[PDB]
Amino acid sequence: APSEIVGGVPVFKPTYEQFEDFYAYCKAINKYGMKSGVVKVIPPKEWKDKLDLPYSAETLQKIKIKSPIQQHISGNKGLFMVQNVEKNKTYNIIQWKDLSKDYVPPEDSSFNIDDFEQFRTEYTIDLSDFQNTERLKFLEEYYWKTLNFTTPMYGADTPGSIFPEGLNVWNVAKLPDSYLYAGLWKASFSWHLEDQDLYSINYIHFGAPKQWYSIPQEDRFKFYKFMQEQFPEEAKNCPEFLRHKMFLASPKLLQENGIRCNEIVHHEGEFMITYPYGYHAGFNYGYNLAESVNFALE
């Protein structure tokens, strides 16, 4: 199996025949993902058909977004650090979709099983705006400029799954323990490797795309050292401080420091796979719901 294209990041678009087996397809593809930080995998149609949309009323209901996170991001130019502070509230998908009305991208009581049944036509967001490359570019530029002006909110690490219970192909929830990611515009994930240096799949079920950045394994030593130049204090005692604190570095910056930085856009109905020793970070282009798990190939 070869890659179909590159955005700096390999893009694989296999037939259902090869995509069929998750551990075989990941075993045959590991060499590419072990060079670049991440890898995109666009699934065949025979896969999509296996999905049940719109999600049943109950499914849309089981979605609980507990302890939302608000991020105060402090920094000047390409160098920022976030401090997560939790809200004790918990949201449902409808409240979340509503909440996203306060987190708009720049231009240029009690609920009932009936409410979610009504919501089966209202759960998605318009996407004819994220097709424009210049639009995405514009947003990303605004994102980095205005990082420290607003505090974004992220419904991250919320246990659950909206994959079909009987889906036995590439089902994040059940692999041979998954979490949902309720995204809002400007919600960010800082630079990091996975716990115990595992892999991870990330599939967007619906909503706005994500911006991804990764460090080619080759340059992870340059990267780690540079991030020591910066944030000298945080680096002092702690050897694994990138796993401790939340730092944000822009590609443009890293690039102009000898550090290669991959970048790609992650759309709904697509998988991102991160690999051991592949640093990654980014943000969400708006309201969305994703699902992910850490895993190993041995």
Ligand X SMILES: O=C(O)CCC(=O)C(=O)O
Q: Which residues bind ligand X (CB under 6 A)?
A: 156, 181, 189, 200, 202, 274, 290, 292
Task: Give min distance, CB of 67 to ligand X, in A.
Answer: 15
Span between the terminal Cα atoms of the chain, in Å: 20
Which pair of tokens denotes residue 32?
């590419």
Taking phi over 0 as left and psi of -120 to 50 as alpha, with beta for the rest, 143 belongs to alpha
Which residues precede chain breaks (C–N over 2.5 Å) in the chain?
108, 176
Residue closer to ligand X, measured from CB, 60 or 182: 182
Residue closer to ligand X, measured from CB, 116 or 275: 275
Task: Give min distance, CB of 203 to ligand X, in A.
Answer: 9
Task: Give min distance, CB of 243 to ligand X, in A.
Answer: 13
CA distances from 204 to 30, 71, 81 (A): 22, 22, 26
Closest residue to ligand X: CB criterion = 202
Residue closer to ligand X, measured from CB, 120 or 174: 174
Task: Give min distance, CB of 186 to ligand X, in A.
Answer: 12
- Is the bond into 54 cis (omega within 30 degrees of 0)? yes
Tell me the H-state helices in the chain.
16-19, 22-27, 30-33, 45-48, 57-62, 93-99, 113-119, 133-145, 220-229, 232-235, 251-255
Amino acid 52 reads D
Task: Give min distance, CB of 287 to ligand X, in A.
Answer: 14
Residue closer to ligand X, measured from CB, 116 or 266: 266
Q: Would you state the torsion angle of the CA atoms of residues 163, 167, 172, 175, taken in this order, to the nearest 10 degrees?
A: 150
Residue closer to ligand X, measured from CB, 116 or 181: 181
Task: Give min distance, CB of 128 to ligand X, in A.
Answer: 23
Task: Give min distance, CB of 292 to ligand X, in A.
Answer: 4
Chain centroid offset of residue 297 CA: 21
Residue closer to ligand X, measured from CB, 3 or 294: 294
Cβ atoms of residues 187 and 257 within 8 Å: no
Residue closer to ligand X, measured from CB, 94 or 184: 184
Longest dimension (CA), the chain: 56
DSSP 132: -
Which pair of tokens denotes residue 247?
């730092």
